[PDB]
Amino acid sequence: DAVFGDRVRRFQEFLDTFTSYRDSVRSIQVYNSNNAANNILPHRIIISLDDLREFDRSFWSGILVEPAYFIPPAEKALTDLADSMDDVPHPNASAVSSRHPWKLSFKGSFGAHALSPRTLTAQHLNKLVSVEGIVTKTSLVRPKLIRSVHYAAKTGRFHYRDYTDATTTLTTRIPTPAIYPTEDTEGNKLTTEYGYSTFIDHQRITVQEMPEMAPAGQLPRSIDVILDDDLVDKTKPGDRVNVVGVFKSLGAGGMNQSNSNTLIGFKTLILGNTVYPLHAARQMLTDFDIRNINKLSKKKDIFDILSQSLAPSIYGHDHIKKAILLMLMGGVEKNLENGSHLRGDINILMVGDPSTAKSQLLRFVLNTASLAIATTGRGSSGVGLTAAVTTRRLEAGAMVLADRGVVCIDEFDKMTDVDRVAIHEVMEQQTVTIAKAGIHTTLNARCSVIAAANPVFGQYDVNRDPHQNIALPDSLLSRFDLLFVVTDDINEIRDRSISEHVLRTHRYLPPGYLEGEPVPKLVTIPFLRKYVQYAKERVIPQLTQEAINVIVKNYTDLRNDDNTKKSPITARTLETLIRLATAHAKVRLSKTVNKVDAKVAANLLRFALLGED
Amino acid sequence: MGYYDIDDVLADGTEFPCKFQYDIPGLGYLENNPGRPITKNTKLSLPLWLARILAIVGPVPFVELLPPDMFSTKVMNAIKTDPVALDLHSINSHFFSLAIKWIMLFSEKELANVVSELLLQRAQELNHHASSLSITNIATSTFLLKLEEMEKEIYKKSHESYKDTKRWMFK
Amino acid sequence: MSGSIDVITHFGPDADKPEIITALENLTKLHALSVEDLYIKWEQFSNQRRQTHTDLTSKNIDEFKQFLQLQMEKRANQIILDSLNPENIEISSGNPNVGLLSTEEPSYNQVKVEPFYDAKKYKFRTMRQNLQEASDVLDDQIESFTKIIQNHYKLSPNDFADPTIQSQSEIYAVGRIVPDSPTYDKFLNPESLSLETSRMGGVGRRVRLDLSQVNELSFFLGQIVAFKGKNANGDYFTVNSILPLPYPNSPVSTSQELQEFQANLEGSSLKVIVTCGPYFANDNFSLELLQEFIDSINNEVKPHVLIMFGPFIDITHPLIASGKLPNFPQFKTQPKTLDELFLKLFTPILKTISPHIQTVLIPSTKDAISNHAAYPQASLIRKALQLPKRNFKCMANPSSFQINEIYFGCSNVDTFKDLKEVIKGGTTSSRYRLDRVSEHILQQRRYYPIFPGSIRTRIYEHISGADLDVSYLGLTEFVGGFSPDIMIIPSELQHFARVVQNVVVINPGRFIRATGNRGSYAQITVQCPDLEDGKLTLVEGEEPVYLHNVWKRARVDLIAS
Amino acid sequence: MFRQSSEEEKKLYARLYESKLSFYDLPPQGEITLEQFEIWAIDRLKILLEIESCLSRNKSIKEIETIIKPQFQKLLPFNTESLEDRKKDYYSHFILRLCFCRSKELREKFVRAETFLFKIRFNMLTSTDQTKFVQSLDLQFISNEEKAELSHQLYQTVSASLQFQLNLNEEHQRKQYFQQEKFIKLPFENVIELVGNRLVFLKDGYAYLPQFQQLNLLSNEFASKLNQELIKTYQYLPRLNEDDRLLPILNHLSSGYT
Amino acid sequence: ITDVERFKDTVTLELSCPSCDKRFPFGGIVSSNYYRVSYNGLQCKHCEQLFTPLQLTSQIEHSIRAHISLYYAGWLQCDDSTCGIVTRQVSVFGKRCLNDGCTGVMRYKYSDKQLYNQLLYFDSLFDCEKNKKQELKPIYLPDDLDYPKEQLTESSIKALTEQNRELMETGRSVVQKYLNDCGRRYVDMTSIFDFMLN
Numbered sequence A: 001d002a003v004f005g006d007r008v009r010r011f012q013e014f015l016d017t018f019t020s021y022r023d024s025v026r027s028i029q030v031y032n033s034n035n036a037a038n039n040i041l042p043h044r045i046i047i048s049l050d051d052l053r054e055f056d057r058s059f060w061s062g063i064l065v066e067p068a069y070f071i072p073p074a075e076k077a078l079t080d081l082a083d084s085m086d087d088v089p090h091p092n093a094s095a096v097s098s099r100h101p102w103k104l105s106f107k108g109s110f111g112a113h114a115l116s117p118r119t120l121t122a123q124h125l126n127k128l129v130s131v132e133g134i135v136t137k138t139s140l141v142r143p144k145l146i147r148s149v150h151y152a153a154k155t156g157r158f159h160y161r162d163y164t165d166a167t168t169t170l171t172t173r174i175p176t177p178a179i180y181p182t183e184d185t186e187g188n189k190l191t192t193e194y195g196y197s198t199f200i201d202h203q204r205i206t207v208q209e210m211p212e213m214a215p216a217g218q219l220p221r222s223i224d225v226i227l228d229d230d231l232v233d234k235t236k237p238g239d240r241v242n243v244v245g246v247f248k249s250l251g252a253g254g255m256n257q258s259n260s261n262t263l264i265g266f267k268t269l270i271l272g273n274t275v276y277p278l279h280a281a282r283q284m285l286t287d288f289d290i291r292n293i294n295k296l297s298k299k300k301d302i303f304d305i306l307s308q309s310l311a312p313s314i315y316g317h318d319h320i321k322k323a324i325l326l327m328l329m330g331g332v333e334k335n336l337e338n339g340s341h342l343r344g345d346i347n348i349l350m351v352g353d354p355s356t357a358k359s360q361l362l363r364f365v366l367n368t369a370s371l372a373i374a375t376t377g378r379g380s381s382g383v384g385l386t387a388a389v390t391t392r393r394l395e396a397g398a399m400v401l402a403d404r405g406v407v408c409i410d411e412f413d414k415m416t417d418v419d420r421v422a423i424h425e426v427m428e429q430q431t432v433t434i435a436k437a438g439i440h441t442t443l444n445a446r447c448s449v450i451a452a453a454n455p456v457f458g459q460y461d462v463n464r465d466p467h468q469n470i471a472l473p474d475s476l477l478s479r480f481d482l483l484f485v486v487t488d489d490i491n492e493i494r495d496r497s498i499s500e501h502v503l504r505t506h507r508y509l510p511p512g513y514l515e516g517e518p519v520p521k522l523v524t525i526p527f528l529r530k531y532v533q534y535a536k537e538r539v540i541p542q543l544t545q546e547a548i549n550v551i552v553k554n555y556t557d558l559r560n561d562d563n564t565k566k567s568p569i570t571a572r573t574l575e576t577l578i579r580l581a582t583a584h585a586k587v588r589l590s591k592t593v594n595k596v597d598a599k600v601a602a603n604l605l606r607f608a609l610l611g612e613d
Numbered sequence B: 001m002g003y004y005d006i007d008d009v010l011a012d013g014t015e016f017p018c019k020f021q022y023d024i025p026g027l028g029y030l031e032n033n034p035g036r037p038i039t040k041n042t043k044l045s046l047p048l049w050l051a052r053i054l055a056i057v058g059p060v061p062f063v064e065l066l067p068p069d070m071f072s073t074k075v076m077n078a079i080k081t082d083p084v085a086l087d088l089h090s091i092n093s094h095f096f097s098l099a100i101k102w103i104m105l106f107s108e109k110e111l112a113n114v115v116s117e118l119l120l121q122r123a124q125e126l127n128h129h130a131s132s133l134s135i136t137n138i139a140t141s142t143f144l145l146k147l148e149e150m151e152k153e154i155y156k157k158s159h160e161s162y163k164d165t166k167r168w169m170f171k
Numbered sequence C: 001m002s003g004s005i006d007v008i009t010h011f012g013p014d015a016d017k018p019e020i021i022t023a024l025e026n027l028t029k030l031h032a033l034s035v036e037d038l039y040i041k042w043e044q045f046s047n048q049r050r051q052t053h054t055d056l057t058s059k060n061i062d063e064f065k066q067f068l069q070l071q072m073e074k075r076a077n078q079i080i081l082d083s084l085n086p087e088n089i090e091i092s093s094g095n096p097n098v099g100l101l102s103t104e105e106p107s108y109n110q111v112k113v114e115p116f117y118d119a120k121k122y123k124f125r126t127m128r129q130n131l132q133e134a135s136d137v138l139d140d141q142i143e144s145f146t147k148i149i150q151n152h153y154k155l156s157p158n159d160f161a162d163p164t165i166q167s168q169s170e171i172y173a174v175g176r177i178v179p180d181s182p183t184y185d186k187f188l189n190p191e192s193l194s195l196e197t198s199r200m201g202g203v204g205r206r207v208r209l210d211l212s213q214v215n216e217l218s219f220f221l222g223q224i225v226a227f228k229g230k231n232a233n234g235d236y237f238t239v240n241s242i243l244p245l246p247y248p249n250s251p252v253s254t255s256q257e258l259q260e261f262q263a264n265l266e267g268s269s270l271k272v273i274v275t276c277g278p279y280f281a282n283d284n285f286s287l288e289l290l291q292e293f294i295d296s297i298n299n300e301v302k303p304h305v306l307i308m309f310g311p312f313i314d315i316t317h318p319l320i321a322s323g324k325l326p327n328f329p330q331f332k333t334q335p336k337t338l339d340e341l342f343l344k345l346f347t348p349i350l351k352t353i354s355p356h357i358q359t360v361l362i363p364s365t366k367d368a369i370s371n372h373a374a375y376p377q378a379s380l381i382r383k384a385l386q387l388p389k390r391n392f393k394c395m396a397n398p399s400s401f402q403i404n405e406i407y408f409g410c411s412n413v414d415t416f417k418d419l420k421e422v423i424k425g426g427t428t429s430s431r432y433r434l435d436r437v438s439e440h441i442l443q444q445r446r447y448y449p450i451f452p453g454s455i456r457t458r459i460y461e462h463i464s465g466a467d468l469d470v471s472y473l474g475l476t477e478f479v480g481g482f483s484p485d486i487m488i489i490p491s492e493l494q495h496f497a498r499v500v501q502n503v504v505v506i507n508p509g510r511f512i513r514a515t516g517n518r519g520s521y522a523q524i525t526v527q528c529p530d531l532e533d534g535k536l537t538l539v540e541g542e543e544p545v546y547l548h549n550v551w552k553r554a555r556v557d558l559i560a561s
Numbered sequence D: 001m002f003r004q005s006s007e008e009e010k011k012l013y014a015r016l017y018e019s020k021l022s023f024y025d026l027p028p029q030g031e032i033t034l035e036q037f038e039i040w041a042i043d044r045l046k047i048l049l050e051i052e053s054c055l056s057r058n059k060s061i062k063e064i065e066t067i068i069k070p071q072f073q074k075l076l077p078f079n080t081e082s083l084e085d086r087k088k089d090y091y092s093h094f095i096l097r098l099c100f101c102r103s104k105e106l107r108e109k110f111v112r113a114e115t116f117l118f119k120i121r122f123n124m125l126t127s128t129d130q131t132k133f134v135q136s137l138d139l140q141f142i143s144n145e146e147k148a149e150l151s152h153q154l155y156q157t158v159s160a161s162l163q164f165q166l167n168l169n170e171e172h173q174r175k176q177y178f179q180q181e182k183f184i185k186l187p188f189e190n191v192i193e194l195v196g197n198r199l200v201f202l203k204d205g206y207a208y209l210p211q212f213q214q215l216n217l218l219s220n221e222f223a224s225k226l227n228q229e230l231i232k233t234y235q236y237l238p239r240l241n242e243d244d245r246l247l248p249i250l251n252h253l254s255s256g257y258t
Numbered sequence E: 001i002t003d004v005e006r007f008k009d010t011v012t013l014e015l016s017c018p019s020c021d022k023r024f025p026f027g028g029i030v031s032s033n034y035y036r037v038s039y040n041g042l043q044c045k046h047c048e049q050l051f052t053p054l055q056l057t058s059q060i061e062h063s064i065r066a067h068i069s070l071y072y073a074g075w076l077q078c079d080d081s082t083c084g085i086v087t088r089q090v091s092v093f094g095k096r097c098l099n100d101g102c103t104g105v106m107r108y109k110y111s112d113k114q115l116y117n118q119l120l121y122f123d124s125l126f127d128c129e130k131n132k133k134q135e136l137k138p139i140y141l142p143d144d145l146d147y148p149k150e151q152l153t154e155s156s157i158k159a160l161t162e163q164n165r166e167l168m169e170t171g172r173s174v175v176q177k178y179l180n181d182c183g184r185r186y187v188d189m190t191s192i193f194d195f196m197l198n
């Protein structure tokens, strides 16, 4: 028993020596105390396991090899530190007896104890381990009783008692029957005070080895993990995750009398102490990034620099690159006070001859957008592309999964008519609605669509109408903001330029390799992703009178002047002008749309629509 | 450190990160463009037999050496927690040669104390696997894939010594 | 317009409310950063707080001001004129090893420079003079001389009596010359002199002196004197005769030591150069003359030893006193203190001195590079001056040190100027003053026997003085109780070299004049000691020892710098 | 088997604080500043003033420890390797000797406060540090046969104390601890405060004291030796009177207790 | 003791402008009609000359050495109000008055205390913390004709002190050089523990 006190003292010395943990305690406390007077941060701290090694090796190896005897006193000492620091007076009834101490978490240098579900072995029981894999199942969240409070009617005295179960504590104790006491030691009838009692959250999950590591087509192996309090619901199935915790056993293992002749083994678990994700998308900016982004935005022609830095390995097609950049920035989504909604996201279609880089260019967006789903037009059904029924439960399709993202559709011309018509809602109302046996529900699908197709005659025929070359209904083409036609026109200097370009491309060697070993200015893509993220989060350009003066004139002329234009012109064309102008102003990091943005947007729409600039 | 030693000849060719302190005409071939100058505060990766001189000759010398990734803080913590489990072969094929060269160059005290412990702790298991003679392959083969090129020679000359003695005795 | 639109073209149009404009304008004016810089830092501030609603309110701007000050302070935390004995002694050729590049250890021709004092005794704390301790030193001086006089003249202790008590019999009295009036007004005549007795001799009382019966005298304030006379009336002590104070003995060496010193120089003459500061003019800090001199030292003169007296950086220099120090364009980084000024100006020049020349540095009480600002004065800190240990030696002030057999006595206080004599008689007045002053120094057995020390005043404001720490004046006495062979006391007066009572007394003069014109330095040639040439005097005793007689075998040339 | 094979002041204070506490046994040497003299004395004086204030308010050891421990890091650090902290602690104690040797009331107040601070700091130690500190002070355990012969009486004496002071409510735990516990025999007059509370067993003029008790002997020896040293300090105060620059500081320090 | 009380008898530090020769009292980082402390250092308000660090530190060192030389001039004064004789002569008894019939006690007119306090006053002027807290001896009183009309804010003083930290530390280092040699400072425990030498 006496050893527990000395371990508390020794961890107190550690906490006094390495002062960056005191600042963490105090900052969480003052933050919580501020907003309480008007979200709340958890009572949890993460310690570097390296600091503890350099402070005291005997305590470090104790935490790492005998956690049941070292983690509890260390955690107790942390609570005393946080409790001795100043705190708000006159606590309420529930605060006075919360039964809520602070809790620890760990990072850095696990050494031999960094494992995977295949290799976790009986030698590692009762050690502190780190495992990696994929989440496959998650239980429902449930509350769990740990303490109850009672008021004695006659004497006016408040009583209480505590409960334990094998997964609630690192050390082992006699189990408790989960009964509520009805009567006092002195015969007084008792009452139960809910709201003063304490309950905590509980959730079980399962983690499996990654399929990339599975040997010989053999069955994969997995472990169950226990989570509670703050750790609940921070994961979902399909997540790649790294878990830290104590590996432990449970139950009687059939030695309490059973028919098995004790051939069956004991049960085992990992008690979740800390959870970290794995990147397999998001980035977080440093101060230097904000400075560089703001400085670069004042160049005369940022749009050209950024657009030409998209897919530099593809020669030509300047305007399609500019259109893709404006798509990645997007417009501004409006919700009016009466609940009415106005669309913000831009859709693009491109149709053309064989081999003209359509699929290759479409592939680039999938590797620079923060959320992107890819599909081929014939490998997907209307229900699979939007939503389907199962058991009643309703299951999402690809357009519902990419909600605030982009969806790429290749071989669009092969999609059947029965499949295409499921998409007409999603590209304007940005919702999916189902009315089938036992179900009625609406779902959100706010994404931007980009797609590629082949013309009807196998190559584009200029001697026939665009409707004859493009077999799609007018109501569908109207929903694409920009429609691009592209062809392989044979010419000497064009052929020479392209061929020399691809040959220069095929002579690349990566930096760390000798020759023959197997494996203007352009901003790098890892910087362009930060630029796009920053611009989409921090600036929301408002429209201006000077921009409107250009938009109205262009729309009425473009609609009323008779020309051989390749797409129907409708009330949706006006919105395309507003969206494109807003997106260009956003590239420029401007707080307002100006005459320049409207002019550029008009000059892009005119090129795509009327084929010439 | 002999002149004709192949391993020393081969270890001096590893590249280290570097930064320039003067602009110089025509030396752009270091940046793989012979037609251009080098400019101040440019950063390049150069082999050690060249960087070891350009960091010394003047005053301010032409190049400054940046702290390389194979001596990063993560590696030091990995070394100090469990030296026997560590995969030095993946970190760098010639680790204990480059370590001594870098120590001589900057006269480091603490790095020497870390590296001495690492060598002394790994020699123990190396002797264990050297002593163990058949009258097994998997258990030995898992550790002997984490040895440096430096450590393999010591293992080979130890194993042969024990085996020759055993052969002579039981004969 | 301008600030408002500049804000509204970086911050949103929501900033149009004039309080917000005023707050942001205040920030840019306070911290000198532009509006767009403020917008960038506002964006830095909007990060890291989970506050997507970082709205441009007054409270958010207050927190941004606090953030800005935190960033500011964190960035700060991140960031031949005259000659003595020319007809008898040729100028030495100097050290032959000077100019030889050879790294080889200087094997044979090693002039040995050795201090002849306890350096630790000079490392006392200054600016704390106890009056009782000062008075004890002054009393002990009188008592020490009483013992010397008693032994020399073979007088009985009962022959000494209190001169302040009326006596009809002639008595012997030892005391200190003091003014008759404690508030005396800077001019002392023979009739205004009194004798202060010791505590034991006369209970520290003062008696007026009647010098009517003395025909020839030369007295100064603070002088210890011995008189035979009587106090017949109780008012004045009538002096019948002045007892001359005995001179100290001369240094001696054994035959073996002299032969060793002769072998060390291979029979060649010793060459010593002596310079005294200041080393730049009163209107600039140019050391061109010193550089030229050092080049000559290294290539033509080639001395064995160089003695340099301060001040190196005179604190009383007019440009320092007026604060009109110039910029030094030759330096990449300007000096920030006078110590750094020495390190940038003097240290590069002094390091060019040949390592075969032993360099002795003696400070001045006016030297800014010395924190010990009192006489007696501790040595300069050689390491702080970044000077090499091999050939630079920093000595105290005064300093007694030995070069081979020759004992040098050095004091960097202007005793010759400061000592004002009260003289009577034709014979005394006809004698050269600096001889008489030199004799006073030798008889008193102290380099600066004047008390109270001299002071310099301007229209009155105190400027400077001898700056005597009276409690430590025992360190200014001749070490070992013998005179030096060569005594060097720099003075503002005209340079000279003379033989006074077998001691070569040298004032090298100032190295550079106030106007920038060349001053003077002293070149000392001393022939090697030879037991066979008869220039040494054998003193008979248990162990035969020899008087050095440096004055017979030394040439001193005073040379334009 | 294989086999291989002023600075003095700093070493002195390293030796004096290896035990983490000291009886303040030895003459300091070298120099510090007069500002340091005043400030260090005032810092220790503030801690002792609060100790005496809490004792006059009749607060318990736990309450005083809660009040005083945050003040060490600001005024008078403890459990520290710093030479400056060690010199500050040592010198401040020695200064307040010269302030509080002057009268019986001042000596009693200073001895009381300093002994209570000694108790507080001893409670802060680990048992190993306590053992090493006691052993360093050159401070008779009974034989196993004598313990066996007196086992009934000793167990009857300590059984309640084991339950209340060491929380050993189980009799089985008390028996195991008693089997492992050592006992000290000394004259009853040396532990009379424990005698009056009947916390020790008495036989033939000797008191039998368990090893988990007896800290009052250590603190009483500290108090007694400090009182004797203060009496000595008082006898050579005329030598302190040779530096006038110290007397106003000492008068100021003593005025807060008068 | 406050700096105001401690330094009541100290001589104010006067600096002479290297360009226009105007002399003015220096009181640290405070408002003054004669000088301004900017981010670049000390500036004369008369001619806008910026002081180099050497120009400032040399004047401080000159003032320090002037006070030291004055101390060693050794003027003594009798404490008897009727005699009050001032002389540089020292009797062999030291404290005995040299005027016949006077029983007063001779004392240094400029004592080691006054010199030490003067040096500390100079040190305080360059203490960054004292400047930030505005704990320096004032060089102007509110009723003085030269009282500055515009006062520096506390925030401005803290900022200017941080910006001029290197200059202030350099000036302070010059003062500390002499303070470390001042005998009035330290206390030797070795000699003091003569009872243990009983």
Ligand SMILES: Nc1ncnc2c1ncn2[C@@H]1O[C@H](COP(=O)(O)OP(=O)(O)NP(=O)(O)O)[C@@H](O)[C@H]1O
Pocket: A313, A314, A315, A316, A353, A354, A355, A356, A357, A358, A359, A360, A361, A454, A498, A502
């Ligand atoms: N500048 C370029 N212009 C055209 N094709 C290029 C260019 N650079 C490379 N290619 C190559 O063109 C080939 C065909 O590109 P791809 O994107 O599949 O054409 P596509 O429009 O999808 N043709 P298709 O699959 O028949 O509809 C690929 O192998 C590319 O590497």
Ligand SMILES: [Mg+2]
Pocket: A355, A358, A359, A360
């Ligand atoms: Mg293709």
